[PDB]
């Protein structure tokens, strides 16, 4: 009846969008991740993909091209690419991989 | 029959069991009289949560962490709001400035202030109080 | 070769890859989208989301850009990106840049 | 008691109802004798689907589309495989070269050959034949 299932592609953008949203609203503005907000994503739900829970600054600079210290929705979204890349890519140069 | 006002959130048998100590958890039981608070609208829209005849008075820790026992500090003043989802909403005016409104963890306890914004559904509490109908 | 145990969010990136995998193993080679694998994908799985099934060829050219015409294992992926933003982003991309 | 071999897939009341015409659909009924085929292992691992005492013989259309009526062409020869999921698997050796194994749409009909890989679970059929136990 109600609660109709959409396509697999609508399912998967939603599941990441809701997760995003449960971090975006942590501090000022429920769209932008600020620095802490951003670090909270990786440090909690990302211990394997990007095991670098120390050089989040590097990611931040690599992401926030304008260096406003807000990853707007679309800026933040960049990470998901680096994720979706890493899962295939991860270190296809040395490791290996798996 | 204004009496023991039961309140909880998140689908699943779990009730807010308050203890004089302060460590209130989402106990899924109704045998021991420790899951009832005297919820009422003190001021225009301002509702207070005080487990008088069962536990203690609430006193949020800067919204971030929800607790109660010593004194019902202003932190315990929340704006009564209703959502068209069969759930009650309470905005901690004391921290409304940060868009923070009381949120508890059904399987953890009441303490999600840094996550009391639009993201966690646990903010939509389901009340089962004995109204005067 | 393929995946033992993953995580919660790793499932939902798999489920869409599994769609990819059962469409690209059509003419040659399951590891690359081919162009009666791609067009069949847009016409079947993306007929509502991607309202441009008749102008795939442009998207293909934009995607492929080495232009080997193997839509590679991240050239292709971009498409899921374009749908991902599309839900938010009706048309409003433009860009032009060498 | 080798007789009417019922076969279907995808959770949900739906049986493969074969008709002399050829247009076989997943009819969810057991009142009319039109959902039974004479499934048996003809050769070592090669099982055939022939609705002799009820419909017609199958003859896949290049695997892509599944049909049957005129003649039981080699297209109807499938390798009998079993999956540890309480389901039967049949590989259309005629097209095994392309890694294609008979797949039907519970709410559509048997015709998903270009999608018969490790994606569409409909390939895992659930048989309810009268064995000789």
Swiss-Prot record, chains A, C:
A UniProt-annotated Pfam family: S_100
Q: Which UniProt keywords apply?
A: Calcium, Copper, Cytoplasm, Lipid-binding, Metal-binding, Phosphoprotein, Protein transport, Repeat, Secreted, Transport
* Biological process terms in GO annotation: mast cell degranulation; positive regulation of canonical NF-kappaB signal transduction; positive regulation of cytokine production; positive regulation of interleukin-1 alpha production; protein transport
Residue ranges spanning the membrane: these are none
Q: What does this protein do?
A: Plays a role in the export of proteins that lack a signal peptide and are secreted by an alternative pathway. Binds two calcium ions per subunit. Binds one copper ion. Binding of one copper ion does not interfere with calcium binding. Required for the copper-dependent stress-induced export of IL1A and FGF1. The calcium-free protein binds to lipid vesicles containing phosphatidylserine, but not to vesicles containing phosphatidylcholine.
Q: Which GO terms describe its molecular function?
A: calcium ion binding; calcium-dependent protein binding; copper ion binding; fibroblast growth factor binding; lipid binding; protein homodimerization activity; RAGE receptor binding; zinc ion binding
Disulfides per UniProt: none
Compartments in which it is found: Cytoplasm; Secreted
Give the gene name: S100A13
Presence of the UniProt keyword Phosphoprotein in the record: yes
Return the CDD domains for the record.
Answer: S-100A13 (cd05022)
Q: What is its main location?
A: cytoplasm
What this protein is called in its record is Protein S100-A13
Q: Which residues bind Ca(2+) 2?
A: 64, 66, 68, 70, 75
- List the PANTHER family: PROTEIN S100-A13, S100 CALCIUM-BINDING PROTEIN
Q: Which InterPro entries match?
A: EF-hand-dom_pair, S100_Ca-bd_sub
- Which cellular component terms (GO) are annotated to the entry? cytoplasm; cytosol; extracellular region; extracellular space; nucleolus; nucleoplasm; nucleus; perinuclear region of cytoplasm
From what organism does this protein derive? Homo sapiens
Q: Does the keyword Nucleotide-binding apply?
A: no
Gene3D superfamilies attached to this UniProt entry: EF-hand
* Tissue note: Expressed in heart and skeletal muscle.
Q: Per UniProt, where does Ca(2+) 1 bind?
A: 32, 37
Q: Which residues carry this modification: Phosphoserine?
A: 32
List each copy of the EF-hand domain by range: 18-53
Q: Which domain of life is it from?
A: Eukaryota
The protein's assembly and partners: Homodimer. Part of a copper-dependent multiprotein complex containing S100A13, FGF1 and SYT1. Interacts with FGF1 and SYT1. Interacts with IL1A.
Curated annotation (Swiss-Prot), chains B, D:
Q: Which residues bind heparin?
A: 11
Explain the post-translational modification: In the nucleus, phosphorylated by PKC/PRKCD.
The protein, known as: Fibroblast growth factor 1
**Subcellular locations according to the entry:** Secreted; Cytoplasm; Cytoplasm, Cell cortex; Cytoplasm, Cytosol
Q: Which organism is it from?
A: Homo sapiens (Human)
- Which InterPro entries does the record cross-reference, listed alphabetically? Fibroblast_GF_fam, IL1/FGF
Which SMART domains did the record assign? FGF
Query: Known consequence of changing residue 111 to A?
Result: Loss of LRRC59-binding
> Which GO MF terms are attached to this record?
fibroblast growth factor receptor binding; growth factor activity; heparin binding; integrin binding; S100 protein binding
Q: Which UniProt keywords apply?
A: Acetylation, Angiogenesis, Cytoplasm, Developmental protein, Differentiation, Growth factor, Heparin-binding, Mitogen, Nucleus, Phosphoprotein, Secreted
Its principal location? Answer: secreted
Task: Name the reported effect of residue 105 to E.
Answer: Reduced integrin-binding. Defective in integrin-, heparin- and FGFR1-binding, and defective in inducing FGF1 signaling, cell proliferation and cell migration
**What is one Gene Ontology biological process annotated in the Swiss-Prot or TrEMBL record?**
activation of protein kinase B activity
Motif Nuclear localization signal at which residues? 2-5
Say which family it is in: Belongs to the heparin-binding growth factors family.
Tissue and organ distribution:
Predominantly expressed in kidney and brain. Detected at much lower levels in heart and skeletal muscle.
| Purpose of the protein | Plays an important role in the regulation of cell survival, cell division, angiogenesis, cell differentiation and cell migration. Functions as a potent mitogen in vitro. Acts as a ligand for FGFR1 and integrins. Binds to FGFR1 in the presence of heparin leading to FGFR1 dimerization and activation via sequential autophosphorylation on tyrosine residues which act as docking sites for interacting proteins, leading to the activation of several signaling cascades. Binds to integrin ITGAV:ITGB3.
């Amino acid at each position: 009846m109600a609660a109709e299932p959409l396509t697999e592609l609508e399912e998967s953008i939603e599941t990441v969008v809701t997760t995003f949203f449960t971090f975006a609203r942590q501090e000022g503005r429920k769209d932008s991740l600020s620095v802490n907000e951003f670090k909270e994503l990786v440090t909690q739900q990302l211990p394997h993909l990007l095991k670098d829970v120390g050089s989040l600054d590097e990611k931040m600079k690599s992401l926030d091209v304008n260096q406003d210290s807000e990853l707007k929705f679309n800026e933040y979204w960049r990470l998901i690419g680096e994720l979706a890349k890493e899962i295939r890519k991860k270190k296809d140069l040395k490791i290996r991989x798996x | 029959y204004k009496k023991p006002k039961l309140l909880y959130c998140s689908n699943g048998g779990h009730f807010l069991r308050i203890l004089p100590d302060g460590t209130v958890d989402g106990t899924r039981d109704r045998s021991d009289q420790h899951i009832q608070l005297q919820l009422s609208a003190e001021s225009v829209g301002e509702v207070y949560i005080k487990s008088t005849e069962t536990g203690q008075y609430l006193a949020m820790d800067t919204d971030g962490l929800l607790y109660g026992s010593q004194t019902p500090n202003e932190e315990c003043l929340f704006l009564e709001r209703l959502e068209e989802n069969h759930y009650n909403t309470y905005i901690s005016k004391k921290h409304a400035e940060k868009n923070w409104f009381v949120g508890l963890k059904k399987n953890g306890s009441c303490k999600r202030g840094p996550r009391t914004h639009y993201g966690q559904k646990a903010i939509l509490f389901l009340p089962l109080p004995v109204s005067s109908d």
